[PDB]
Write a protein that binds this ligand. Structure first.
Ligand SMILES: [Mg+2]
Ligand SMILES: [Mg+2]
Lengths: 221, 221
């Protein structure tokens, strides 16, 4: 019997990945470094530091310094913020209402550490989440694909792994939920092949958030 | 214009694959041959003759004679029919009602020559199907994963490939639908990994007939 539902924020609650992928691609290009929009989708869920390091290690044969990480990340963040603000993923508010009406605790698990997440989550999904029942960059040392953030979600909610379900759209996020020993539902909201989500260890796979919403009662039976 | 929905029978309309897999496994075992239950699921959709020939080709390094094909097929079918009759796959009747209410033509495209199941279609799905709008083992030269049975169905229905959708549960059936150029929805109703259905060319994947039914209006929007 389930108690909690653990949502990723990017690509699950907000339709932000076109923006995250473009900004990552463009900022790398500005620095003479090659990160494709597709590879940015492959790295969804990673910390900015980790993403920057991976490109530096492959292209430059070394790690980025902390000041280079912070510089490039701030530049990516400025660019991401220059775009008209990201909107709700279709089906998210509807699934959240279903989950809540069934007595389940909605939770957010995200590697973002921005304050206005609180405001933006609350404005888009009013009454759904509680800031204390949420995992952010203020908590994440390692981040996806390490199961750390989902394990910290379990801890914060006082949950056993078999009392939760993970809703994820990205393979590093699926892998994180899976390697935490939590039942993981993949929603293929991006441009990647469904196989990549199943290969990462998803127990179920749906084509979209709305189809997950439509199917929720049936899979919970 | 979507005009018709092309259903497989076993694993889609009837929950018969536990029996089919068991019967093949056991009959082969009686004959001193190795066909596991899992491999029977992999060969779902093929003619009886092809299935038997594949085992002979691998295990004995030779083709099966026609009388070896005929005897083994006969034993397997009798064994299948010794089990309490296969019941409807949950979701199938509801989806059929929905498809028909939205003006689409239900069709059966199957590799089966199992009279006991074929002749139970009307009693299980009243007012849905018609012999003139069906393709069975009796209709084909090659069968799944040859797109031949699906192309035959399009002809029978007076349809083009972009006017139909295929609902399949088996890798060789998805392949057949895909290679005919028809939009194919895989429903993972057996014990195989979902990746094998996506790899065979499924445009969409759902874990069950009921969740497909639940999601039908959404994916057709
Ligand atoms: Mg995500
Ligand atoms: Mg089948």
């Amino acid at each position: 019997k389930l108690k909690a539902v653990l949502f990723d924020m990017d690509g699950v609650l907000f339709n932000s990945m076109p923006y995250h992928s473009e900004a990552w691609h463009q900022v790398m290009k500005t620095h003479g470094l090659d990160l494709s929009r597709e590879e940015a989708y492959m790295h969804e869920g990673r910390t900015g530091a980790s993403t920057i390091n991976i490109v530096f290690q492959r292209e430059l044969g070394k790690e980025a310094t902390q000041e280079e990480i912070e510089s490039i990340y701030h530049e990516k963040s400025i660019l991401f913020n220059s775009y008209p603000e990201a909107e709700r993923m279709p089906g998210a508010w509807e699934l959240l209402q279903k989950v809540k009406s069934e007595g389940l605790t909605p939770m957010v698990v995200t590697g973002s550490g921005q304050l206005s997440l609180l405001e933006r989550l609350e404005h888009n999904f009013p009454g759904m989440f509680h800031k204390e029942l949420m995992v952010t960059a203020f908590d994440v040392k390692y981040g996806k694909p390490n199961p750390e953030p989902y394990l910290m979600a379990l801890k914060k909610g006082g949950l056993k792994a078999d009392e939760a379900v993970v809703i994820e759209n990205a393979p590093l996020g699926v892998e994180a939920g899976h390697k935490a020993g939590i039942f993981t539902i993949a929603v293929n909201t991006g441009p990647l092949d469904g196989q990549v989500l199943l290969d990462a260890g998803a127990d179920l796979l749906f084509p979209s958030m709305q189809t997950l919403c439509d199917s929720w009662d049936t899979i919970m039976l």
